[PDB]
Amino acid sequence: YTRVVWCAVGPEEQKKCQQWSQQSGQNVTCATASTTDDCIVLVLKGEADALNLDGGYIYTAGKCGLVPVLAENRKSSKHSSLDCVLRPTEGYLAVAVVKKANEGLTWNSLKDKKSCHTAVDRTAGWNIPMGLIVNQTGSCAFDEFFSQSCAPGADPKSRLCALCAGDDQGLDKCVPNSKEKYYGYTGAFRCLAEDVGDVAFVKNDTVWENTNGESTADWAKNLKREDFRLLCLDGTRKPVTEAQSCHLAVAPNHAVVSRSDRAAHVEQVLLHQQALFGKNGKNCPDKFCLFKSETKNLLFNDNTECLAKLGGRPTYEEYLGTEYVTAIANLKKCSLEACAF
């Protein structure tokens, strides 16, 4: 009857997907690709049905005619009465984080310092910070601003990949999937924590989830929040508790995309799947939890409370908002109607 094919990016997501596939009685199955771009192509071809994406990729996917189905929703103070599935999403804060110990480093002295990015083309790790850097720089030269970086998905042999480490044994350097040690929110923050870079571009949640005992990963277990600072755009430095006054931008939540002709079908099965393995699901802690992967953010961010319905039936532009959509257009003149494929 109603069977959905999920697209996993890399071997670790593949493994989580296989687990979810087993436990769902094959109501969901898995396709695997090496990168997000490749997963998008599988969906266009019709060989995969769906995957969850950061806003940067929702933009790529959108030009290709894919559509947002459901969005990640995390815990909230305000909007509290409403059920998670119906509650509007709040977005996330993209911030630039540094070590307190690295004094006199401000937004205005980042020139030729070392940077850690989640990946190329992602919202907090790339589009926002580079969008800003290009704009206040006049130059589309973003690859020469930092002396060295880890920016997964850039040319392996460039300075933008210099700080990337690859895997266990040094392979897959700078691949934009979790084989790369410094990939994604967790990896970029690890890049800073281990003093590989001077600055990481992540979101506010990442700092709080890998400090003060929240993570039990060994590179993060001794980390303290007071040891970091946020860099604000006004040239000041603030404690991490101040993200609401010291952020680069507010980002649209990650969301599930699918081909438009499959949207309804994909929506139905996942609402059912989340009842079963979601945050309150018939079986989260006993058999399987869709929203956990021990801080690795596999398939979905681990802080996800549920996947929310989008009311207003957004096109991908409305979903990303005009604000962010122009930020991307502008950045992309550097490196108007298209679809990468």
Ligand X SMILES: *[C@@H]1O[C@H](CO)[C@@H](O[C@H]2O[C@H](CO)[C@@H](O[C@H]3O[C@H](CO[C@@H]4O[C@H](CO)[C@@H](O)[C@H](O)[C@@H]4O)[C@@H](O)[C@H](O)[C@@H]3O)[C@H](O)[C@H]2NC(C)=O)[C@H](O)[C@H]1NC(C)=O
Ligand Y SMILES: Nc1ncnc2c1ncn2[C@@H]1O[C@H](CO)[C@@H](O)[C@H]1O
Ligand Z SMILES: *[C@@H]1O[C@H](CO)[C@@H](O[C@@H]2O[C@H](CO)[C@@H](O[C@H]3O[C@H](CO)[C@@H](O[C@@H]4O[C@H](CO)[C@@H](O[C@@H]5O[C@H](CO)[C@@H](O)[C@H](O)[C@@H]5O)[C@H](O)[C@@H]4O)[C@H](O)[C@@H]3O)[C@H](O)[C@H]2NC(C)=O)[C@H](O)[C@H]1NC(C)=O
Ligand U SMILES: *[C@@H]1O[C@H](CO)[C@@H](O[C@@H]2O[C@H](CO)[C@@H](O)[C@H](O)[C@H]2NC(C)=O)[C@H](O)[C@H]1NC(C)=O
Instruction: Report the interface residues with ligand U, using CB under 6 A.
Output: 1, 24-25, 27, 272, 276
Range 104-143, binding ligand X (CB under 6 A) = 131-132, 135
**184 in a labelled binding site:** no
Q: Which is nearer to ligand Y, 124 or 193 (CB)?
A: 124
Taking the complex as a whole, the smallest distance from the CB of residue 248 to ligand Z amounts, in Å, to 13
Burial class (CB in 10 A: 0-12, 13-18, 19+), 194: middle
Spatial CA neighbour of 114 closest among 139, 154, 79, 145: 145
Query: Residues 91-110 vs ligand Z: string with x where CB under 6 A?
Result: --x-----------------
**33 in a labelled binding site:** no
Name the token pair of 228.
């970091």
Query: Residues 91-130 vs Fe ion: string with x where CB under 5 A?
Result: --------------------------------x-------
Applying CB under 6 A, which of residues 34, 208, 289, 332 lies at the interface with ligand Z? 208
Query: Which of ligand Y, ligand Z, Zn ion, none is residue 320 near (CB under 5 to 8 Å by kind)?
Result: ligand Y
Q: Decide: 197 and 114 in contact? Cβ < 8 Å.
A: yes
**123 in a labelled binding site:** no
| CA–CA separation, 40 and 44 (whole Å) | 6
**92 in a labelled binding site:** yes
Query: Within the chain, what is the greatest distance between any pair of CA atoms?
Result: 61
SS3 annotation, 187-251: HHHHHHHCCCCCEEEEEHHHHHHCCCCCCCCCCCCCCCHHHEEEECCCCCEECHHHCCCCCCEEE
Half-sphere exposure of 121 (CA within 13 A, CB side): 18
The 8-class DSSP code of residue 164 comes to -
**254 in a labelled binding site:** yes
Range 62-91, binding ligand Z (CB under 6 A) = 75, 77
Range 36-95, binding ligand Y (CB under 6 A) = 90-91
Binding segment for ligand Z among 58-66, 154-162, 205-213, 293-301 (CB under 6 A)?
205-213
Name the token pair of 54.
């950061």
> Sign of torsion, CA 292 296 301 302?
positive
Where is the binding site for Fe(3+), in residues? 54, 92, 185, 254
Q: Which residues bind Zn ion (CB under 5 A)?
A: 318
**Residues of this chain that bind ligand X (CB under 6 A):** 131-132, 135, 323, 326-327, 330
